[PDB]
């Protein structure tokens, strides 16, 4: 009458595995009869491990996943939607901050691909002092942002108004999505068709081009953007919350502000990490996975999970901020009002492919093709004609799907 399941995750660092080992021991203590085994897998090797284990009927019952890869698993039908929805029913949809569960919806809108445990978000980081030393209030829309970037621009001195991604990489697609979605421009419409060559998408693309006249020249990827912000080449930068551990190390957290691209609405990019439960397992394995993920969502356990990356990972469960784990963390206290500001921006999470309560799985192929960041790259670095590049991009996607 004992049952054994596996928890596959990507925390291969010994510190993180120590935290997961104590969570598991706490779980097993409260649920005699259930053993959980760790399966740490480097993020690099995640997909190969998954196809290898699933083609041998040895897929672990519980799997840590980002929301985009959960879409690929759900399309391959590797996810037990009823088990996931059972967990969400237990803790309640109201346990999650608004905007969070929409992102993990299935393509038909009827269920979810996983149970969210954390998120990182992206937006505009800036240096509070430099914007005073220039006479500028923090920007609240496209116009104010462009104006602030122009005022802080100064390329003769190798200083620039904003660090903006422009490379042929997912980072550019993510940061550009924030402006496009702030203009109600999504790559998909509510019927699952590719809607790229649209008026509202052209406006965002035209605005991004104007804004990049104030960024470092050339193809800027993750290292270019981070370096420029960290060494003072630009006092504004679009980046994820993973900049926050670096500000803690190199600089002064008091001096960092955060603003959200806003035009017709506000849009922050976001990546969710979830625990999902896989399909095809014995019923007793499935119920054990259900209890395990439900356990992981209780306040003290979810808080220990999220604090494995303090500053970088945000809580998506409303209970985390009530725990002593959260309020007594040194990193969280060093950041001041920032963690509450960031959590407050979770209702504004928008991503390409998530249209209402449906997240279309063909967005993975769109992203996998690089057409959207390449399009942005061509018009910003290459100086290509914007209207015919947008039109060529629509045609490449139509031909792709
Ligand atoms: K198993
Ligand atoms: K089932």
Residue numbers in the entry: 27 to 427
Please share excerpts from the published article on this structure:
We also report the first crystal structure of non-lipidated YcjN form (ΔYcjN) to a resolution of 1.95 Å. We chose the ΔYcjN protein for these crystallization studies because it does not aggregate in solution. The crystal structure was solved with P1 symmetry, and the asymmetric unit contained two molecules. The YcjN structure is composed of two α/β domains: the N-terminal domain (NTD) and the C-terminal domain (CTD) that can be divided into two subdomains (CTD1 and CTD2) (shown in teal, gray, and light blue, respectively). The NTD possesses a three-stranded β-sheet flanked by 11 α-helices (excluding linker segments). The CTD is composed of two subdomains (CTD1, residues 145–298 and residues 359–383; CTD2, residues 384–430) and is composed of three β-strands and 13 α-helices. The NTD and CTD are connected by three segments, including β7, β4, and α15. An analysis of the binding pocket revealed that there is no discernible electron density corresponding to a bound ligand deep within the binding pocket. However, a smaller electron density was detected at the edge of the binding pocket near tyrosine 95. SBPs that bind carbohydrates can also be members of subcluster B-I. However, these proteins lack the CTD2 domain, making them structurally distinct from subcluster D-I proteins. Due to YcjN’s molecular weight and the presence of the CTD2 domain, we group YcjN into subcluster D-I.
YcjN is a putative substrate binding protein expressed from a cluster of genes involved in carbohydrate import and metabolism in Escherichia coli. YcjN is a poorly characterized putative SBP in Escherichia coli, whose protein-encoding gene is located within a cluster of 12 genes. In this cluster, three genes are predicted to encode protein components of an ABC transporter, including two TMDs (YcjO and YcjP) and an NBD (YcjV). Furthermore, previous studies using radioactive palmitate labeling have shown that YcjN is a lipoprotein.
